[PDB]
């Protein structure tokens, strides 16, 4: 996250970090004690670990819970050889359940209709340990940022790339603040009377925080039935 702020401990208890050959390559969100929702381009075959209850990725705070990923379910319409960032959503099953507490809490997921109503409120929070500057290094402390929704027409004019209808744009007209590489798979959430709901997955963008460009996100409303079905306990 470029131009964000340090999250306080337990401020985004649904956030998880993904570690593989490189630590903090992507983020995710807790659906429940056994399942994480992330971006399909982050995963594939390749051994991954999930860390919940994380705050500073370089200091043991005793709130962390690390788990091995035993199953990766990319959405069946995801195909990297056709488009690396379209249908960009996947689920990860954990080897053992997480223990829910003040630092490890699931994100709410409303039905399809209400997830779309909450996205249309126009203001969401994104978080992650991605780059804090364009081409810079990943964050030590979890970062967060409030990003306004950008209308589809403005979003289409911002790029030569194809923005599909179940992708959305969020960010600032003048740049300066945005999600970035290392944040993909992480959450875009909307606060509804003190309860946060998952409205998007952090997906991609051309560079980070550049004026005229926006962050591209997966609309979670498009996948609510697939998420509820595959993550049933």
């Amino acid at each position: 996250v470029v131009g964000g702020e340090d999250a306080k401990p337990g401020q985004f208890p649904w956030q998880v970090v993904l570690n593989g050959k490189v630590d903090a390559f992507c983020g995710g969100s807790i659906v429940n004690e056994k399942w994480i929702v992330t971006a399909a381009h982050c995963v594939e075959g390749v051994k991954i670990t999930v860390v919940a209850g994380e705050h500073n990725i370089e200091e043991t705070e005793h709130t962390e819970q690390k788990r091995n990923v035993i199953r990766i379910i990319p959405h069946h319409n995801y195909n990297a050889a056709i488009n690396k960032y379209n249908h960009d959503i996947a689920l990860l099953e954990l080897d053992e359940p997480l223990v829910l507490n003040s630092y490890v809490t699931p994100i709410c997921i409303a039905d399809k209709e209400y997830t779309n109503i909450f996205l249309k409120f126009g203001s969401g929070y994104v978080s992650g340990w991605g780059r804090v500057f364009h081409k810079g290094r990943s964050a030590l402390v979890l970062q967060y940022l409030r990003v306004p929704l950008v209308d589809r027409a403005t979003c289409l004019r911002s790029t030569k790339f194809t923005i599909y209808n179940n992708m959305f744009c969020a960010g600032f007209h003048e740049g300066g603040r945005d999600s970035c590489q290392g944040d993909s798979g992480g959450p875009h959430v909307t606060e509804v009377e003190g309860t946060s709901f998952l409205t998007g997955i952090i997906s991609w963008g051309e560079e980070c925080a550049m004026k005229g460009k926006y962050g591209i996100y997966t609309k979670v409303s498009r996948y609510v039935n697939w998420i509820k079905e595959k993550t049933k306990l």
């Binding site: 306080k8 401990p9 337990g10 401020q11 208890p13 649904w14 829910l100 507490n101 003040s102 630092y103 809490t105 699931p106 994100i107 709410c108 997921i109 409303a110 039905d111 209400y114 959430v189 509804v192 009377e193 003190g194 309860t195 946060s196 709901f197």
Partner: protein, 49 residues
């Protein structure tokens, strides 16, 4: 009176009105608000901020 105007005053979900909440929450005595039904319900911050 109707879910089209101010969500029928429901804190979370409305059905034409009958209010409802997401998993881990129960509908409060006023039949509009949502309150935790479990120790760590989804989407809530419980650490001191």
């Amino acid at each position: 009176v109707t879910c089209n105007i101010k969500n029928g005053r429901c804190e979370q979900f409305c059905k034409n009105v009958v209010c409802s909440c997401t998993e881990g929450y129960r509908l409060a005595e006023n039949q509009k608000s949502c309150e935790p039904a479990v120790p760590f319900p989804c989407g809530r911050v419980s650490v001191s901020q």
